[PDB]
């Protein structure tokens, strides 16, 4: 898949079939839901998981003092810099995994259509499976819900591949 579709709003993965009856676009709803649950699970650990602290040391000063004021300015600066790096590492790690799990989900849906079309279709390179067999829109939707049967289209499509 070189590029995505600008006119798809109801899902993250979908199909754009085209046959003699016209061309249609339907969004996949199973793989899109699985990506949401993995994304919403990551936000569950972060949102609303704070810790409470009531009494701390003074973090801002007016009159300059000696060693004790320099120590308090160094303890507070150590905690801020360490938590700033921890926030950077936490966001960058989850952003790396969120993209990596998602691109695997795109490839998994590509493999499921190829696995279902075991002997009636082959890959082309751009993802558009060129099929001239008698497979209408309801036949296309049978692939989507996993109810497509290749036995009734095995002998009807093997001879068509040698013909075309």
């Amino acid at each position, epitope marked *: 898949i070189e590029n995505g579709w*600008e*006119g798809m*709003v*109801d*899902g*993250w993965y979908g199909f754009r079939h085209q046959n003699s009856e016209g061309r249609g*676009q339907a969004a996949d*709803l*199973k793989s*899109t*839901q699985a990506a*949401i*649950d993995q*994304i*919403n699970g990551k936000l569950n650990r972060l949102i609303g998981k704070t810790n409470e602290k009531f009494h701390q040391i003074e973090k801002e000063f007016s009159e300059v003092e000696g060693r004790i004021q320099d120590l308090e300015k160094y303890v507070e600066d150590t905690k801020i810099d360490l938590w700033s790096y921890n926030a950077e590492l936490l966001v960058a790690l989850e952003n790396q995994h969120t993209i990596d799990l998602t691109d695997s989900e795109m490839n998994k849906l590509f493999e499921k259509t190829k696995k279902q079309l075991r002997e009636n279709a082959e890959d082309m390179g751009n993802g558009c499976f060129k099929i001239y067999h008698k497979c209408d*829109n309801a036949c296309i939707g049978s692939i989507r*819900n996993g109810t497509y049967d290749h036995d009734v289209y095995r002998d009807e499509a093997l001879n068509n591949r040698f013909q075309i």
Partner: antibody
Amino acid sequence: QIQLQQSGPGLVKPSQTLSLTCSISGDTVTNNYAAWDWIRQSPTRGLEWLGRTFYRSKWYKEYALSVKSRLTISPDTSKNQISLQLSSVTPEDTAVYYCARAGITIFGLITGGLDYWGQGSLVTV
Amino acid sequence: MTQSPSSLSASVGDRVTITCRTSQSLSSYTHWYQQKPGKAPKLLIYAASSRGSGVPSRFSGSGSGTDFTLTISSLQPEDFATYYCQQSRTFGQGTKVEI
């Protein structure tokens, strides 16, 4: 404050065209995270989906399987209007039509929930 | 899209569970709707887990695989309406609750 008042006559000759204007007040049609569905309700079957339209750099249209070759949805930017046009009407379509706004999205994806509905009836000879 | 109840007469303050069986197992897309007779339907809970605007705290939903239940904690005389279940583009047959 989002208010949708849809107009249009509710008495048309069968085997003809149909017009339905859904005026929009308090909101604009050009919205990234909002679509506009069209839902009809009948005492026989109930609530069912017809189609939707939105704007992602170009006016996009979707339609249901049954009324794929008879429904055209024409949006308008000039005076905040989305117009429904049904062709070759049939007396089985004696039902009320609702213009409702989608776009209760999570993570930028329109999940198909409908908000800020309207009111409108339709009957044919 | 099937719903277990069709017409029930529950008392005021009763707890009723409306179960809407679906075909495809996905929870973030389904919603719940309520329509009074001669009134524009509204959205109570969306994605089967979070209530919408203008919804009291007595409405709750649950999601378990392909089964989704809309539970009312206490029935009210103002809640006499037909309930509808929608997954992505198909609406349920209806659920008429009565006081």
